[PDB]
């Protein structure tokens, strides 16, 4: 569990909010949690937890586990979820999220 940036009650509320598949969104998890409220530097601490390759980015193969970061056991993302999130953070057309194009997708 993160517990290094956002509060638990805020996460547990955002998880159940749209726990169902293709029910949540990349820009609909900062209202219940409070990611945007965090600085671009604080939003990076999470990226280091999403990198299941330690390469430096969060490819789709590791982005589908977005629900496995706040729940640590929940289901993965679909072609209608991962794609969106990637098209909301990456915007570079690389298929991998970075620590420079992530925060931007949060606050902005």
List residues near Ca ion by CB under 5 A: 51, 53, 55, 90, 92, 94, 98
Please provide the size of the chain in residues: 108
62 carries a ligand binding annotation: yes
Distances in whole angstroms, Cα of residue 41 to Cα of each of 29, 81, 106: 18, 25, 11
Residue least distant from Ca ion (Cβ) = 53
Q: Is 17 annotated as a binding residue?
A: no
Residue 21, number of CB atoms within 10 A of its CB: 14
C-beta closer to Ca ion: residue 51 or 104:
51
**Any binding-site annotation on 94?**
yes
Binding-site residues for Ca(2+), in ranges, read 51, 53, 55, 62, 90, 92, 94, 96, 101
């Amino acid at each position: 569990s993160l517990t290094d940036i956002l509060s638990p009650s805020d996460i547990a509320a955002a998880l159940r909010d749209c726990q169902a598949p293709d029910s949540f969104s990349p820009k609909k998890f900062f209202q219940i949690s409070g990611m945007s409220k965090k600085s671009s530097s604080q939003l990076k601490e999470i990226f280091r937890i999403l990198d299941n390759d330690q390469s430096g980015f969060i490819e789709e193969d590791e982005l589908k586990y977005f629900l496995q970061r706040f729940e640590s056991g929940a289901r993965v993302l679909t072609a209608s979820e991962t794609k969106t999130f990637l098209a909301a953070a990456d915007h570079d057309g690389d298929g991998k999220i970075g620590a420079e194009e992530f925060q931007e997708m949060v606050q902005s």
